mmCIF file of C-alpha atoms in Angstrom:
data_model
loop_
_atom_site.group_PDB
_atom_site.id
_atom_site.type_symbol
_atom_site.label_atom_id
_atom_site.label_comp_id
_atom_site.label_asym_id
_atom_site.label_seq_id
_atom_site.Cartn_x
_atom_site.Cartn_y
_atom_site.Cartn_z
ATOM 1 C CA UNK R 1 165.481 68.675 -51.511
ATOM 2 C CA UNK R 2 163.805 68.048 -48.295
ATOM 3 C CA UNK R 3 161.658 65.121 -49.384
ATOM 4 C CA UNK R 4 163.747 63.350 -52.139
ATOM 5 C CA UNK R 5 162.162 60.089 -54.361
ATOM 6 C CA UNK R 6 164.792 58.167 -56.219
ATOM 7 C CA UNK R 7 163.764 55.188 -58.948
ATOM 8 C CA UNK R 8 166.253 53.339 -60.366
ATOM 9 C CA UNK R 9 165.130 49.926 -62.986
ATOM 10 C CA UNK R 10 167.441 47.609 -65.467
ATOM 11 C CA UNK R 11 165.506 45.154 -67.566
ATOM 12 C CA UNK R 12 166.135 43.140 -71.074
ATOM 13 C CA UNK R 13 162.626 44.085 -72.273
ATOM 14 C CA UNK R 14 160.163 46.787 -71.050
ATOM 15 C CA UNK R 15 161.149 49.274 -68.340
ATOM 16 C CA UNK R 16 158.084 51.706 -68.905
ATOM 17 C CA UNK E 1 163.890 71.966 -55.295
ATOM 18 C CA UNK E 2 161.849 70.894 -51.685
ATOM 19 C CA UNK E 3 160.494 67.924 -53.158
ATOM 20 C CA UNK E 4 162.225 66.195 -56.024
ATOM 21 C CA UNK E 5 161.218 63.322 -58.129
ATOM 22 C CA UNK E 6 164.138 61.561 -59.905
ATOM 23 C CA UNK E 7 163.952 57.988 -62.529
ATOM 24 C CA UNK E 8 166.150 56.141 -64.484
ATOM 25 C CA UNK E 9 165.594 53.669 -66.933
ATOM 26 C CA UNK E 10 167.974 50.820 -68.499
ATOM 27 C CA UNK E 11 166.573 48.237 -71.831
ATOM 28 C CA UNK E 12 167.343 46.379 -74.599
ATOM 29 C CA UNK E 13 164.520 47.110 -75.773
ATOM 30 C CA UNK E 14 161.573 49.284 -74.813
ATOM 31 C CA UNK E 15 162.509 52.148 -72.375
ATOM 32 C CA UNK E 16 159.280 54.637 -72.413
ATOM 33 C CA UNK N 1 166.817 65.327 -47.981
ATOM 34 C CA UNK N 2 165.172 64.424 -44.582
ATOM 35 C CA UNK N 3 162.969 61.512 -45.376
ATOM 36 C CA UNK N 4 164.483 60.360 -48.163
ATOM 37 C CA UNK N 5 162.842 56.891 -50.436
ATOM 38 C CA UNK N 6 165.170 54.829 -53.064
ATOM 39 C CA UNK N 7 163.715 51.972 -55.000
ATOM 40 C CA UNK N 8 166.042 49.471 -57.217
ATOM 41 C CA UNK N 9 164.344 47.028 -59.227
ATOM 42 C CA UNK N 10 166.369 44.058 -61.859
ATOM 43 C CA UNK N 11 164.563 42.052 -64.204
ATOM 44 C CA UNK N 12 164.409 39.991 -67.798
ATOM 45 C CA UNK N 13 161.591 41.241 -68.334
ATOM 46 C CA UNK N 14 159.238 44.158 -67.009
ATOM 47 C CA UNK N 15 160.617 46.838 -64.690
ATOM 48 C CA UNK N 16 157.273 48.973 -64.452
ATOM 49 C CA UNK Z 1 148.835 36.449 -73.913
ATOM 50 C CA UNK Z 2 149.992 33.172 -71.417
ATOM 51 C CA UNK Z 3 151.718 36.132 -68.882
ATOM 52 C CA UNK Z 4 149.805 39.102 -68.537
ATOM 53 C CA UNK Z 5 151.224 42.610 -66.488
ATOM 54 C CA UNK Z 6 148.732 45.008 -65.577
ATOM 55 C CA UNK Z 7 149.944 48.618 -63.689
ATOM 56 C CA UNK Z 8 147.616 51.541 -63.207
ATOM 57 C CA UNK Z 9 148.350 54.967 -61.275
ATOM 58 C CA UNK Z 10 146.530 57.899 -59.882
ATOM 59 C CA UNK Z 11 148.196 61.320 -58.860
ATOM 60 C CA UNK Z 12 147.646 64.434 -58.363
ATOM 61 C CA UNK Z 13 151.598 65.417 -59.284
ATOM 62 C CA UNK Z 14 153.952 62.534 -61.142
ATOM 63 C CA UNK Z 15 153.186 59.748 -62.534
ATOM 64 C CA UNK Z 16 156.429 59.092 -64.137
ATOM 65 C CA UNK L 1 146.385 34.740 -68.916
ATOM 66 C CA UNK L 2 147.513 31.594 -66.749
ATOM 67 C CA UNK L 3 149.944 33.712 -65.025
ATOM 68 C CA UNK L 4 148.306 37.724 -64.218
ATOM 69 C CA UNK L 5 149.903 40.343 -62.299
ATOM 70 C CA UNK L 6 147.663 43.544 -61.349
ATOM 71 C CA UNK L 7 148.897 46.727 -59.565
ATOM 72 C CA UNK L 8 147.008 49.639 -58.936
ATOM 73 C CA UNK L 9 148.380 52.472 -56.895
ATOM 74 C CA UNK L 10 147.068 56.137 -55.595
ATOM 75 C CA UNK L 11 148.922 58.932 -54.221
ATOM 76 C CA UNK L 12 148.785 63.069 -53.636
ATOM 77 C CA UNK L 13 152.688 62.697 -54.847
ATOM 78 C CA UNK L 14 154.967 60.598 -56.605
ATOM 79 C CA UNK L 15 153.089 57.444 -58.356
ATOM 80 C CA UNK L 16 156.506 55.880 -60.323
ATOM 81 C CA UNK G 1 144.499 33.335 -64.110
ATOM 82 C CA UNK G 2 145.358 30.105 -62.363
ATOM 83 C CA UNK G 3 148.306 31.962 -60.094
ATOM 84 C CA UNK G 4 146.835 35.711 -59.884
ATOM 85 C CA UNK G 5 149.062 38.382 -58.038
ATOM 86 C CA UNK G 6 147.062 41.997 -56.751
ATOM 87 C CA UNK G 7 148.141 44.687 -55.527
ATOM 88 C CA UNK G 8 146.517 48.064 -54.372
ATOM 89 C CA UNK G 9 148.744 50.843 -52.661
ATOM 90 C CA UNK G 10 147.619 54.552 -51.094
ATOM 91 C CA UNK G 11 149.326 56.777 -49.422
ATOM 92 C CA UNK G 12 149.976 60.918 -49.394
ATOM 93 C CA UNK G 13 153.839 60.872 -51.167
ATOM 94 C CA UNK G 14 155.691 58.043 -52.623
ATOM 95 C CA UNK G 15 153.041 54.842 -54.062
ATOM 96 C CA UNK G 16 156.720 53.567 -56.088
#
């Protein structure tokens, strides 16, 4: 889009 | 769209 | 897009 | 418990 | 606990 | 706690 929000997480326990 | 929201989640255990 | 934010995040334990 | 992580969030569109 | 992390976050858009 | 970590964000788009 024109305003774009990217997250990205790795984890062994808990990626809420 | 013109403004998109994007996540991705890795675990073991607990991804909510 | 044209202001675009990317967040990466590693952990044992607790991406939130 | 002995390590203790709070989060809380406030939108008006995603709170993912 | 002995060891306490707090976040707290507010936004029109995009609270991840 | 006895090591306490806050944070507080606010913004218009993006409090990741």
């Amino acid at each position: 889009g024109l305003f774009d929000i990217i997250k990205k997480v790795a984890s062994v326990i808990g990626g809420l």
